[PDB]
Amino acid sequence: LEYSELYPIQNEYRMMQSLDGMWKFQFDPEEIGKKSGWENGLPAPVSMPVPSSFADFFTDHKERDYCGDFWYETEFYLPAEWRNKKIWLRFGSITHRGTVYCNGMEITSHEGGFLPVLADISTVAKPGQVNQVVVKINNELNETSLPCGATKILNNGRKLAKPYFDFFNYSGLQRSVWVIALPEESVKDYSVDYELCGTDALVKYEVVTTGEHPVIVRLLDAEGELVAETEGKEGILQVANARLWEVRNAYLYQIVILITDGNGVLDEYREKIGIRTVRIEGTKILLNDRPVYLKGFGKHEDFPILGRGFHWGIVKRDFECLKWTNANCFRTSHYPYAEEWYQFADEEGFLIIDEVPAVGMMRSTRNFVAAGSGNYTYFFEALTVPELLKSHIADTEEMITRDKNHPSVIAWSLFNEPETITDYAYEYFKEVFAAAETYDFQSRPMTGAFEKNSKPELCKCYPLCDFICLNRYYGWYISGGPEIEEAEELFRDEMDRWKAKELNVPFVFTEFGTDTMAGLHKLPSIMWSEEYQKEYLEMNFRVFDSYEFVQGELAWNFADFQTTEGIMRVDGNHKGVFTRDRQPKAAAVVFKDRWE
């Protein structure tokens, strides 16, 4: 990467100033902004909170559902004392793609809506003056970038996003924005990897800087005491009597990376890390050499009004709920979350399966969204797939570079419900997995979540995985309700087929659930009732517990969340175990009791 993914810090060498607040915002349905000079200021803006998704503020459909180009603008005073620094705009994300301007000048563009965008404004920044940032953003969906979908043009020319995925197309500036100042020679990246040696541990590391001066690396314990120190851009820190980062029992050291010229220090980067190992051994997931059974949820970045907008309050409530259920794990379904989620998981000892936004790659869904009105003959995969692969690999590189040093991150999920039953899909995913392994200094477990279409007899992609994640809805989409006994039979039949393959890898259920409307009670239960959610879960548990190789269960979903409206979604997806405002349905206690 031609920029650093490192989270920004404030110290003697590095400065940061938040640009969060009310920005100026303007929709550009006619796509006239750039030729009209909007990069120098929006002509008729409204106010827009940052961070937030824009959609749910408005009271009219066309603004909520807006699809196309739209622009953000703000101004900030740059301290004069930042003069002799490399000055960057850092967006937590720009959803889905955008071009950043500063003081009227084009700085950078980015594709991918869920990872940081770094824009080097050093050459146009005006220290000791007010500066301007303008961002052109686009939220259309296509088949050459993630997540996948289509864009429909309505009779009036109005665009409408048509996802191939089951979540609302929230977009905008959904995460915090900073302007930061770095030393001219700085720490750009580092990687740690761990080895356990009895009571001791080794922290292997690499550091990438933007210069040639010597590097010193120190490790401090949770009290700030020096426990190890070495020199060089590559090395090993030896930690006596190491306090390991444990599941639901975190311990964090602080790594301190210094660039020196002998006379003094040029840069200092510090970050909390946790000494822990993760590996797959047969059907076991080993954390610090001991098996762990994953218990938790797929989540979303989703909350009323804010949409995917980041807020520490959502983090705090969600973790309190997670702990109350006795969970130990979540998957970042279906995109990398704001960095703060991982920082907090590190502190709380939660395990994370970190997922790239490779969702929407199922052919039947694509075809369905094309058949709506209307198309049944024209598709061009041969042309788009190579471009999609490039985008997928780029997002993977960005995710892993951003997240690798979190002790919480124990696995990469490289897809959710793609086509996997052709040799072509194998060749596609082989490249993604190869890239992931190359970018991950730890070479930690890699996986993806498979839809039921990936039958054990047909799937060509599970051998790429270190463990296999299954999304299954036996008792919801398949043989629901009065047919639930048949659902259980079908589920056991499938798992018997997996069993007979004797793959000797762990299986984790990454999704299972039922839409459940809080307050819908029925005796006997019906699909959509709270009681049916409980019974469905009990049936699933009986199945899970029948197979030795099943080593985790992440329910879909932690909480009800927003989707595109339609005949199958009653104000979003109601498969939450909690409501959207984070309160438990009856099924939450079922998990609490089982996971205790």
Place this chain on the structure above:
Amino acid sequence: LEYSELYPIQNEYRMMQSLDGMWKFQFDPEEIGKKSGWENGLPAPVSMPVPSSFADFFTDHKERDYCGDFWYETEFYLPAEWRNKKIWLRFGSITHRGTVYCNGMEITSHEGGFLPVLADISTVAKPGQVNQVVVKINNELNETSLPCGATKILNNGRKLAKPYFDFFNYSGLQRSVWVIALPEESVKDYSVDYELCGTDALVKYEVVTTGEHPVIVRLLDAEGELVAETEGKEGILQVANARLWEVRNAYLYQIVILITDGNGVLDEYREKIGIRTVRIEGTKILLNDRPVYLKGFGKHEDFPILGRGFHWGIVKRDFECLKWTNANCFRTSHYPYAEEWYQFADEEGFLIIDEVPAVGMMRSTRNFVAYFFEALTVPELLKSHIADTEEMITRDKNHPSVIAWSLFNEPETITDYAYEYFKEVFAAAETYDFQSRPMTGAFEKNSKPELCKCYPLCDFICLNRYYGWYISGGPEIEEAEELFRDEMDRWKAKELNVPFVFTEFGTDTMAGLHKLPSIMWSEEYQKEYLEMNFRVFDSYEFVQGELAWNFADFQTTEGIMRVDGNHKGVFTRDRQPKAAAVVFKDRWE
């Protein structure tokens, strides 16, 4: 005040750095923190978001309902360049009262949970180093500070807040926290007042600085062009062809206040202001010399999970909803809101009645929960009330949106004791408001026209009435209407020649509860109740505003009369319209 209320800005002379984020937090049930060195760091903290109310994060009752002392801590790196600036911690608020420590040193304490707390850390700050802030906060309720209530001790020593007010006792660090740097000689306060002269306007001003150097004041238009400039700490800016700030049609100038040393500038303060006048003339409320009828709501700072935690997203959605209803006004029931609400109202052309947290001043409700103004604690309560009033007015006076001060909500007013008490509050408010804009308060039904001693203090009279809810509801709604008209006929007979505004009326309404014929609590009854109230309002010429209770469902103390908070919202807590929202939209159009 021995600190500035001015909103922090970043320029050549002034710096600011946000301390928002995850803070360290610890409950102190045994009240031993200050005995045990907690001001130097909390011994066993958990993480707590700031800004937010703490209560709704937790999954256990005792943490949610915690009442007593509790502590916050964070660390921040102070840029070396801030050396020899006056360095302050600025808390948007500390709810309800607290003591601020920095680097282990006690800095200041504050009583009052809804206005800024400024702590001068100049003498203990360590530029170019990590610094520490620790805050001891207390959220108990008493009868000597606002808002009023009691604190109960359960047989195991556990405290429980017992409000005399109908909102949940949210507390903590509910607004953003900044550390800021100011010049040694700085602009501490300023005030503007307006006069309309045909197509022109005068902006009268006063500036208070911390030194003796000359001051220059400039006024820029919305494009940044200079339209007026004058010298002196007191003066008049003459604006040719002034673009007035109008209801639902704002225009904002920027005032620029410079302290000069002859060849250089020592400080610069800038803020957006709007040229507008407000006055009460007979039974009319005049905005820029034209009558305006107030249409809108009482609100709260209240949202799921965050509690009273400030977020611009809540502001944006709420204003979009307000505009969709064709409202023009809200009251900051029952405490000053985060400053950002007023900044936004200024931009959107909304009118605000700014209310100090003088709620819970009732003897009935006090006596039940636990002669209010006859209690020996009263002299102390008065001091607290006046202090909060001074702070509110000093903070908010320069917002064009703020057109009135509400100095109480539902106190006792029917004795001479109450009159003497409020006379002092109103006199103080008048001294603090450079504009002398209208002062009022919201009266409960117990303040009968024959008995109330306090309405004469008010420039206009605000009534909270629940004829058709607490009085003769449901099958008795026709009786309710008669009783309402009887009361209003009694007010009319006084011939006071002042405007009346209804600052509350509403019905608890469960979203989705439908009934034909309607019942109390149904969406249909909310509509019928409102229609009845409108008929009454429209029968009296002197009624010049209606602010419904409430904009949105909001959190209260648990109890047999509150079904997950107060459901008198016209919108749900997540800001979606009940059937009644359309009724307001159509009427207010």
